[PDB]
Structure formats: C-alpha cells, structure tokens
mmCIF file of C-alpha atoms in Angstrom:
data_model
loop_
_atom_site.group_PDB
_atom_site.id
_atom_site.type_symbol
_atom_site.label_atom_id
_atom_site.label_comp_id
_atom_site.label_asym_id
_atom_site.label_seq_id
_atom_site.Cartn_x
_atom_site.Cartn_y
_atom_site.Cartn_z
ATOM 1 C CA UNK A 4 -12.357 38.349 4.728
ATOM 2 C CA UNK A 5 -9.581 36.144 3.781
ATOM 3 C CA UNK A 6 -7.867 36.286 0.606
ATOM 4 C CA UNK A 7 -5.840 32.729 -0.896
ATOM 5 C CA UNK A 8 -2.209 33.930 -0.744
ATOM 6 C CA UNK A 9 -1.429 34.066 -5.029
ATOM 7 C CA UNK A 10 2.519 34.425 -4.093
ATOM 8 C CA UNK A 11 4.972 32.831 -7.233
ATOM 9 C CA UNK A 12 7.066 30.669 -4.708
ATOM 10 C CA UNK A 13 3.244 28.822 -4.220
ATOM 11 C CA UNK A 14 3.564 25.257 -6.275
ATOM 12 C CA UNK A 15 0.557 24.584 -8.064
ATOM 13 C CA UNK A 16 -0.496 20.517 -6.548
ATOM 14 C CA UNK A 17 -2.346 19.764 -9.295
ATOM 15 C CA UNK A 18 0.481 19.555 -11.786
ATOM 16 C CA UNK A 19 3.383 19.020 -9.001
ATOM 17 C CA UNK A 20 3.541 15.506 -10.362
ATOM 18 C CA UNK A 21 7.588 15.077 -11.006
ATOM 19 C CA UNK A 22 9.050 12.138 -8.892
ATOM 20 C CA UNK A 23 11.394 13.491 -6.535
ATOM 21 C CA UNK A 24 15.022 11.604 -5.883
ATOM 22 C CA UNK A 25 17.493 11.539 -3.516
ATOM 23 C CA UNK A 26 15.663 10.953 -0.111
ATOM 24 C CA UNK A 27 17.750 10.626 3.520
ATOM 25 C CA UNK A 28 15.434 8.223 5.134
ATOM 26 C CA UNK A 29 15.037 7.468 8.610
ATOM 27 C CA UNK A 30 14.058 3.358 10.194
ATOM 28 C CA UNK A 31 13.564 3.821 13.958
ATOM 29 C CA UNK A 32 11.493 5.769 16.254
ATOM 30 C CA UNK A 33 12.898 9.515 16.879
ATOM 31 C CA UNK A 34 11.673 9.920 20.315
ATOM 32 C CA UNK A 35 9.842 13.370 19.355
ATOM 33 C CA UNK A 36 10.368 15.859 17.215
ATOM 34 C CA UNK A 37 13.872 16.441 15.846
ATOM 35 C CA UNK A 38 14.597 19.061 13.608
ATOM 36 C CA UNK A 39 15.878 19.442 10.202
ATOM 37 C CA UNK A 40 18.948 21.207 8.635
ATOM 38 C CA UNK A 41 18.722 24.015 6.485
ATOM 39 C CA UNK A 42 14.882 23.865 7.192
ATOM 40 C CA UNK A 43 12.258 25.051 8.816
ATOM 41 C CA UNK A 44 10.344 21.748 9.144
ATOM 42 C CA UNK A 45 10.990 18.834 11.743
ATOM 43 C CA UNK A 46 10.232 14.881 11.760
ATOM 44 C CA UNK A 47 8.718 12.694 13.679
ATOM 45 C CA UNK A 48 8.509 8.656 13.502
ATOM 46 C CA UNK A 49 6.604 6.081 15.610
ATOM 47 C CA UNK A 50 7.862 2.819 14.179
ATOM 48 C CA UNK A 51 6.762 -0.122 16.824
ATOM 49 C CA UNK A 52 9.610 -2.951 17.196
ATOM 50 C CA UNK A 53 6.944 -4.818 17.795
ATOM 51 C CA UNK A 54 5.612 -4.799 14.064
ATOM 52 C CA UNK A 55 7.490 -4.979 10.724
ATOM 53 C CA UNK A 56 9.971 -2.723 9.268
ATOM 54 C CA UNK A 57 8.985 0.864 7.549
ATOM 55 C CA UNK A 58 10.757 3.230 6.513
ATOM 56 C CA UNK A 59 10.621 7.516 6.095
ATOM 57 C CA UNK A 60 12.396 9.572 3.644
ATOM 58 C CA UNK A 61 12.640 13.544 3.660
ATOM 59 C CA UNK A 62 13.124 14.496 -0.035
ATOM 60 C CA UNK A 63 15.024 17.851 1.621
ATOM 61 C CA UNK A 64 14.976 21.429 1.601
ATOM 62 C CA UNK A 65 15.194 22.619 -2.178
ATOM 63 C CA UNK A 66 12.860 20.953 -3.601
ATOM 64 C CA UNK A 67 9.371 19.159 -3.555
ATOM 65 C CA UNK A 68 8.036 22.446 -1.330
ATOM 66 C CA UNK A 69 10.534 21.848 1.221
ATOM 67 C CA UNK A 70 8.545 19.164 3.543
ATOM 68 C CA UNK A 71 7.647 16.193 0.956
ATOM 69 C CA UNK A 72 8.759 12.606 2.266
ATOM 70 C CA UNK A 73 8.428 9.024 1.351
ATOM 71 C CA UNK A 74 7.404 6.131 3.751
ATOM 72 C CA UNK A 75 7.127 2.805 2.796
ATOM 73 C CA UNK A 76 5.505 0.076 5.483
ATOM 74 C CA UNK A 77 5.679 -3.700 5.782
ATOM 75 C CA UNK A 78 3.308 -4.640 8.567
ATOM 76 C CA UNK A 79 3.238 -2.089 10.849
ATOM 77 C CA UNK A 80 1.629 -2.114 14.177
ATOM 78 C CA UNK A 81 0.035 1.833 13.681
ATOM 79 C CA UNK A 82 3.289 3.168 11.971
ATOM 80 C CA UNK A 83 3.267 7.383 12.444
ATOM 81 C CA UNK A 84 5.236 9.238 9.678
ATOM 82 C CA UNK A 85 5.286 12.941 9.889
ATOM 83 C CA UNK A 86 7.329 15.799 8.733
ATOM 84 C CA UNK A 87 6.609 19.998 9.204
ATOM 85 C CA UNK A 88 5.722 22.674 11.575
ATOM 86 C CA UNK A 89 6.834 22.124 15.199
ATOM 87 C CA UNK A 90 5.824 24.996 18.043
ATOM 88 C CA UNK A 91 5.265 23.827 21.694
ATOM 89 C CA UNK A 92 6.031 27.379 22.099
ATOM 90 C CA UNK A 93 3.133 28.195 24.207
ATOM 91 C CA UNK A 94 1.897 30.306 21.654
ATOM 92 C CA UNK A 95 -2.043 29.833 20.272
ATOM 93 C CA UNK A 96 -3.162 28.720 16.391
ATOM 94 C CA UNK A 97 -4.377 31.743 16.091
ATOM 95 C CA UNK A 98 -0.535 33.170 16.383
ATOM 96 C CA UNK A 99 0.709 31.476 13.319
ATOM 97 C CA UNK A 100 -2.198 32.486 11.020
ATOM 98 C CA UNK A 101 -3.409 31.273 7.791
ATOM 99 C CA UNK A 102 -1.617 28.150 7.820
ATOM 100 C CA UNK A 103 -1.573 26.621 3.930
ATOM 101 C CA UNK A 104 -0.291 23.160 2.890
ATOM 102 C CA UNK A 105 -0.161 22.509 -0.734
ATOM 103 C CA UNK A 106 0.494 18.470 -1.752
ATOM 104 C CA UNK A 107 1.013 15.863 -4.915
ATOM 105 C CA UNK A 108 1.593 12.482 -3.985
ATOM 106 C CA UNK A 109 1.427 8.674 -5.078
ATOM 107 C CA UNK A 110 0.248 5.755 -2.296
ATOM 108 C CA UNK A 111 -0.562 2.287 -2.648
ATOM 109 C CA UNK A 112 -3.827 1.173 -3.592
ATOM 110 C CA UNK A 113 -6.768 -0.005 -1.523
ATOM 111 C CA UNK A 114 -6.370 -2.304 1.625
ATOM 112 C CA UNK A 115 -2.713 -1.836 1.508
ATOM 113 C CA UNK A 116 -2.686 -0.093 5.245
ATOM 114 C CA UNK A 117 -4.544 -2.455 7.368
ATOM 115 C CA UNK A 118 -7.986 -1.599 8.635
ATOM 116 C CA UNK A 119 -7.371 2.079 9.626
ATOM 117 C CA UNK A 120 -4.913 4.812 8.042
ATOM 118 C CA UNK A 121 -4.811 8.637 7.537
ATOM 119 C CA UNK A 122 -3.428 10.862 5.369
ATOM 120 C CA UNK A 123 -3.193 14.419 6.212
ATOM 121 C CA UNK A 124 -2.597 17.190 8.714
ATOM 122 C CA UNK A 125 -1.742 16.050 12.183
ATOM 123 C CA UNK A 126 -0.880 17.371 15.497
ATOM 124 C CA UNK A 127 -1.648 18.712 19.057
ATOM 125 C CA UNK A 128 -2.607 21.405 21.240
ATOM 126 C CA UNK A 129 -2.737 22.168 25.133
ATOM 127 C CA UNK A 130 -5.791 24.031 26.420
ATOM 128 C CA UNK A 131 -4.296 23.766 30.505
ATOM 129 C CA UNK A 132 -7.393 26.345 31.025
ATOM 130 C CA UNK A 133 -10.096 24.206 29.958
ATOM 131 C CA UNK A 134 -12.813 23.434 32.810
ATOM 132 C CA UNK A 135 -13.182 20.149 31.562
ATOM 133 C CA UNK A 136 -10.067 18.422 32.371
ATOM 134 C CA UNK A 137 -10.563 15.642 29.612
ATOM 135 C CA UNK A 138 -10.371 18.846 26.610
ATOM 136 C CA UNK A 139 -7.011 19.937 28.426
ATOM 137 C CA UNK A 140 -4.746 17.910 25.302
ATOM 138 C CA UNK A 141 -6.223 17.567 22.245
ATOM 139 C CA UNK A 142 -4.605 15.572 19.229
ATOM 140 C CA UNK A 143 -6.150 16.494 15.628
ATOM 141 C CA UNK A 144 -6.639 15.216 12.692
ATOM 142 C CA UNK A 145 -7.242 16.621 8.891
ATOM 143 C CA UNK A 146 -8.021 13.835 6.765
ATOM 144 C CA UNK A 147 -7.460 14.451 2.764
ATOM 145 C CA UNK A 148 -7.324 10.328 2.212
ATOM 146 C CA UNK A 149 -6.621 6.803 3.588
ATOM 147 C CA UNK A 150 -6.383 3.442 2.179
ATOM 148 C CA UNK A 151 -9.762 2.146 3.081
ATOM 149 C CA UNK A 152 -10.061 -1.491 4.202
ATOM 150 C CA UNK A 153 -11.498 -5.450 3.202
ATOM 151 C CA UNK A 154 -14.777 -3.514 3.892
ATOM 152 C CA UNK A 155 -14.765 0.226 2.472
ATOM 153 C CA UNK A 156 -13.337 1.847 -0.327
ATOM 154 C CA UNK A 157 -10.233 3.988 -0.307
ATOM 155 C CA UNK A 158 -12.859 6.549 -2.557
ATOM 156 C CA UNK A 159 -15.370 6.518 0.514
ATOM 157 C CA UNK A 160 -14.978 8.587 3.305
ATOM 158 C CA UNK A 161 -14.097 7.488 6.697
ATOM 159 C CA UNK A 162 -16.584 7.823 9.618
ATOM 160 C CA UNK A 163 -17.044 6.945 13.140
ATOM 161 C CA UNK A 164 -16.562 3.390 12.920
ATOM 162 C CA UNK A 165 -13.047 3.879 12.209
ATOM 163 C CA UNK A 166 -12.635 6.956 14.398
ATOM 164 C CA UNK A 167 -14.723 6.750 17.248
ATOM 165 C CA UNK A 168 -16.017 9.758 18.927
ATOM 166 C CA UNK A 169 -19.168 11.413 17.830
ATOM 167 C CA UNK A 170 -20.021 13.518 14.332
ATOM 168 C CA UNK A 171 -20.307 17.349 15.979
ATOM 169 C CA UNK A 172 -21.178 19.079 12.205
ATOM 170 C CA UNK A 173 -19.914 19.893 9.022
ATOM 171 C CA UNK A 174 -18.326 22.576 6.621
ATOM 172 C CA UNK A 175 -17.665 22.723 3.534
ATOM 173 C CA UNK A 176 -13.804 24.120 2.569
ATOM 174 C CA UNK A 177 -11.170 23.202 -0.643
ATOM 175 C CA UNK A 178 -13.567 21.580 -3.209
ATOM 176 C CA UNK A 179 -15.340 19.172 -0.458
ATOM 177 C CA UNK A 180 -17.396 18.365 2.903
ATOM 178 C CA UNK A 181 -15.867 17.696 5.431
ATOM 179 C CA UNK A 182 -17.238 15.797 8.351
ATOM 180 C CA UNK A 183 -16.311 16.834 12.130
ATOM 181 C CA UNK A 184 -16.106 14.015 14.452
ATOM 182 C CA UNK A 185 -14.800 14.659 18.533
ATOM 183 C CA UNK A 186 -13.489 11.596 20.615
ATOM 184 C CA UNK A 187 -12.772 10.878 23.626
ATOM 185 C CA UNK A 188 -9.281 8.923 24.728
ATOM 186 C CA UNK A 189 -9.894 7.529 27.696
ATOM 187 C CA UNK A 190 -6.395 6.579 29.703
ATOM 188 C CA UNK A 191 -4.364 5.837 26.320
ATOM 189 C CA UNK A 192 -1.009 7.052 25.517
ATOM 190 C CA UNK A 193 -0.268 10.763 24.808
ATOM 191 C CA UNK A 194 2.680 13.719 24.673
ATOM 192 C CA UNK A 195 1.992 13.507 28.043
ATOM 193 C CA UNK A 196 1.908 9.977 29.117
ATOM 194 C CA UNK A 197 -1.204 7.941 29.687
ATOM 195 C CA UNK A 198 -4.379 10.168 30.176
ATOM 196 C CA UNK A 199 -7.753 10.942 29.022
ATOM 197 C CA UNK A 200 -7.837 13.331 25.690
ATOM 198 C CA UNK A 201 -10.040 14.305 22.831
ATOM 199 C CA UNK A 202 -8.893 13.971 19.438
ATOM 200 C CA UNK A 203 -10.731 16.701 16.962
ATOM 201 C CA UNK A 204 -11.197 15.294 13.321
ATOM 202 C CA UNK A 205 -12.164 16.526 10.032
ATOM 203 C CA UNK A 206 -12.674 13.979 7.679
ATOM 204 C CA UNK A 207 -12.975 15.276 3.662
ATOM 205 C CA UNK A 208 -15.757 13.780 2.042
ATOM 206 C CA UNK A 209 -14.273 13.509 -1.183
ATOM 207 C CA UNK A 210 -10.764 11.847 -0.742
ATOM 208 C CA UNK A 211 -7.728 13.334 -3.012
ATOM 209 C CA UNK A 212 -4.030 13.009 -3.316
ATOM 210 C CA UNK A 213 -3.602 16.672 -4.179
ATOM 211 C CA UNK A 214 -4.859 20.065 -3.493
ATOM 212 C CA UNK A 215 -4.213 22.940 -1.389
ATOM 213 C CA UNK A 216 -5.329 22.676 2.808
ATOM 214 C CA UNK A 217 -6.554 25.407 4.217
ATOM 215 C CA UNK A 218 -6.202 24.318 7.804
ATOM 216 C CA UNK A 219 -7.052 27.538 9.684
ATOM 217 C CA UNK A 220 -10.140 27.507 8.697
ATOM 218 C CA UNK A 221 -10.567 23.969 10.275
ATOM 219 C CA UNK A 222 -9.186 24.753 13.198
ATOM 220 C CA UNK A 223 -11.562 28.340 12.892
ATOM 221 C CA UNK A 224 -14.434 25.456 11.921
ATOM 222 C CA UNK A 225 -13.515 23.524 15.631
ATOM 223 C CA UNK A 226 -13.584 26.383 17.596
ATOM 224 C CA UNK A 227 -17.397 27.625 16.901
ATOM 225 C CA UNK A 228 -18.358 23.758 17.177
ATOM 226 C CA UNK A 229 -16.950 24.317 21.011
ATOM 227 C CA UNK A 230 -14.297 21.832 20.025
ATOM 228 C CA UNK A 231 -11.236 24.764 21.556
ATOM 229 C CA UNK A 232 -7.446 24.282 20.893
ATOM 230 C CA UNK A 233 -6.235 26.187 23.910
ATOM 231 C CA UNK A 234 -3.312 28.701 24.128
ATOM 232 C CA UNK A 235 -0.154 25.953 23.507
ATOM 233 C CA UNK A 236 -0.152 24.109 19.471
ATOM 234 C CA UNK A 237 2.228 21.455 20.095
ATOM 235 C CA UNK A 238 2.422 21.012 15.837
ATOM 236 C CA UNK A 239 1.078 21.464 12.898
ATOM 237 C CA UNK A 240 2.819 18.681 10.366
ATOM 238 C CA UNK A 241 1.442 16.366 7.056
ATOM 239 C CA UNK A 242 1.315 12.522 8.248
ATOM 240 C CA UNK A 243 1.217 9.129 6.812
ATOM 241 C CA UNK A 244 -0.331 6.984 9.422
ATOM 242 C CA UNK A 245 -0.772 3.117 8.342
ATOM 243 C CA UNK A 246 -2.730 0.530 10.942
ATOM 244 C CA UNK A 247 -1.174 -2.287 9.280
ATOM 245 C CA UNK A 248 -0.633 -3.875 5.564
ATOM 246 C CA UNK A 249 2.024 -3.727 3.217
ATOM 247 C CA UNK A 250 2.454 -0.061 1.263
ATOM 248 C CA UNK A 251 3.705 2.948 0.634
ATOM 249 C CA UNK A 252 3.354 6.721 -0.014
ATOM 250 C CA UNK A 253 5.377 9.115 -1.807
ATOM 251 C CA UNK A 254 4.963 12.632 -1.779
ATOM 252 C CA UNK A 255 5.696 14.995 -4.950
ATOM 253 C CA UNK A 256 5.233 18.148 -2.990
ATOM 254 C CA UNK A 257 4.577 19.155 0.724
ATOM 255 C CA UNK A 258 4.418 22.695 0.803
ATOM 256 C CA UNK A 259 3.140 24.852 3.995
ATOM 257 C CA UNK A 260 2.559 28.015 4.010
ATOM 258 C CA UNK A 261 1.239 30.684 6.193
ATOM 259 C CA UNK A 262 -0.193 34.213 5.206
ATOM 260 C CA UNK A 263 -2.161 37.828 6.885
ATOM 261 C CA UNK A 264 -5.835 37.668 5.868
ATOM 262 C CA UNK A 265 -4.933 40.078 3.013
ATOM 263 C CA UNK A 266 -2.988 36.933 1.438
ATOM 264 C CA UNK A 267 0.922 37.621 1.605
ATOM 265 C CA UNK A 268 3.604 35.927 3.010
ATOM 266 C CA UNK A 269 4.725 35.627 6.377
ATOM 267 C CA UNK A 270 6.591 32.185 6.169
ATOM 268 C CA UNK A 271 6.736 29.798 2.918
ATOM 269 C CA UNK A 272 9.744 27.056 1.470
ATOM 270 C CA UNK A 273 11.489 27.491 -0.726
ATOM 271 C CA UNK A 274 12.694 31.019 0.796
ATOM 272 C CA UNK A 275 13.606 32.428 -2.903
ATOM 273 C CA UNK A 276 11.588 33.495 -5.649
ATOM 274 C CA UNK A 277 12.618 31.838 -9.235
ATOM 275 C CA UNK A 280 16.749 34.466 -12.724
ATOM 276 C CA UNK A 281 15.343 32.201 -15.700
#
C-alpha cells in the first residue's frame, strides 16, 4: 500500500522544461565516485582516452532538482555519465525506501550514440551471500530512453539484441511496460575488477524524456523474478551512457527522492520549501 509522495518541494517533469545555465563540467575519468559540495548527490565519469572527447556538466545544487547535468560526446568508446545517490554502505535497497527520480531533459536525435546507449537509472549491488557465485555483484539498469541505432528507432524499445541476457518477465509501472531482461558478464570488467556478474535490466516499453521513476518498485519487481540485490547497494544514480556517435543530452531536472509507504519525506533536493 504505497502512496506517491504529493510533497510541494516535488517538481512536476512534465512542465520542468526551462534550460538550466551555469554548469561546472568535468572532461576526464573520476576514478569512482566523488562527491559533491553543498549536495547530497555524487558523480561519476568513464571517459576512455582511447575514444574522442566528452564532456559532463552538473547544473548544481539549487536548482534543476539538485542532480540535473549535461554531457555532450564526440565519439566515445562507451562514454558513462552519471550523477546521484552513492551508498556502498553495506546497507540493503530496502533501507533507503521508496526511492523517486523525477526528470525533463533534451538529447540528440536518433543514431547520434552509436549502436547502443541508455538513459536512465544505473548502479550496483553486492549480494556476498548468494549461493551462486556469478549473482554475488550485480550492475542494473532502468531504461526510460536511448538513441536507437542505423537499424531501430530511438521510439522502439530496446531488447536483447542490444542487451544480451535473457527476457525473465514483465510489469507494468509509470505510464508503460517494462521488459525485464538478466545477463550474464562473463570475466569483464567490474567495481571489483574482472569477474563474472549479472546485470538486471528493465527496459520501458514506451521511451520518454520525462516523467517520474519509481525505482523501488523495480527493484521490488527483480526480487520476486529471483533476480536478488543482496544486502550492500553500491548506488543508485541517473546515467547517460553513449556506445559511440556524436551527441548530447541535457537535463532540465534530475530530482530523487525517497519517501515511507504512507508518501512523506525522508530525503528530497532542494532541502527548503518555496516566502513568495
């Protein structure tokens, strides 16, 4: 019995459509997480040397919902932009609660990525306890949108042939479908060094560039699928990911939130309510 958290400091996405200015924007790899001043939020960047130049810019912490950033790519090899929620704290999903991310933002058209790309929630999870020592890290995917390729449109829906894995079910949650998919990572690089994984995805059936994600519910969805997160989220942040291609993104609002089944508050940005 969960109830949508109605709190004023909540920006509605579908009109948070005001161009946000003065980014500090970061070129290089981080090497991790690294945290943010006067925020809640950290950032992450994989930007291969190897590939072309990109680019990442938090918009800051008073404005845009705290966590909205813009990245901008010029060939990429698999460029990984990502800004919110860091734990690692050896604490469960289920700690944290309803977890809520509100978002507005503009991207580059079709085929302007490279042949894979996601937009969405991102992170990982340690399940040390697991009996099957392949589901003891598990990297995760929400997928709102991508860029589609030469050979599917941005509109359709990605499936296995750009994840891999296997389809495990379906819910429906936030206006759409979305499709489950589980894959195996066989001895490819990880938070902790080269090892096999699984990677959990849910893929929304109808692509958007705003709305409101209700991601406990996915990770509530995974769980009763078998698909288990373990006792240690390593993150819980919104991610630009771009294969390849020439592009950008640029975010009006990222706004998380998290809330008690009856709907209020326990952590949200901005801090304040709105004198006139």
């Amino acid at each position: 019995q969960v109830v949508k958290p109605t709190d004023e400091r909540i920006i509605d996405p579908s009109t948070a459509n005001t161009q946000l200015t003065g980014g500090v924007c970061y070129n290089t790899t981080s090497g991790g997480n690294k945290p943010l001043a006067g925020s809640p939020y950290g950032y992450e960047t994989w930007i291969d040397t190897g590939g072309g130049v990109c680019s990442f810019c938090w918009y800051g912490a008073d404005q845009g919902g705290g966590a909205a950033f813009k990245a901008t790519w010029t060939n990429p090899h698999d460029f990984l932009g990502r800004l919110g929620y860091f734990w690692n704290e050896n604490k469960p999903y289920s700690h944290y609660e309803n977890i809520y991310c509100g978002f507005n933002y503009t991207r580059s058209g079709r085929k302007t990525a490279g042949d894979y790309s996601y937009i969405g929630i991102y992170g990982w999870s340690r399940n040390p306890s697991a009996s099957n020592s392949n589901e003891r890290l598990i990297e995760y995917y929400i997928v709102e949108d991508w860029f589609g390729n030469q050979w599917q449109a941005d509109t359709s829906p990605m499936g296995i042939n750009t994840t891999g894995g296997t389809v495990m079910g379906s819910f429906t949650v936030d206006g759409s479908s979305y499709q489950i998919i589980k894959n195996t990572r066989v001895n490819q690089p990880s938070i902790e060094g080269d090892k096999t994984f699984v990677q959990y995805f849910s893929i929304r059936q109808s692509p958007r560039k705003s709305g409101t994600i209700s991601i406990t519910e996915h990770f509530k969805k995974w769980e009763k699928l078998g698909m288990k997160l373990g006792d240690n989220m390593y993150e819980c942040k919104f991610l630009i990911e771009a294969g390849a291609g020439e592009g950008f993104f640029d975010a009006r609002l990222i706004q998380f939130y998290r809330a008690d089944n009856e709907g209020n508050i326990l952590q949200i940005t901005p801090l304040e309510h709105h004198h006139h």
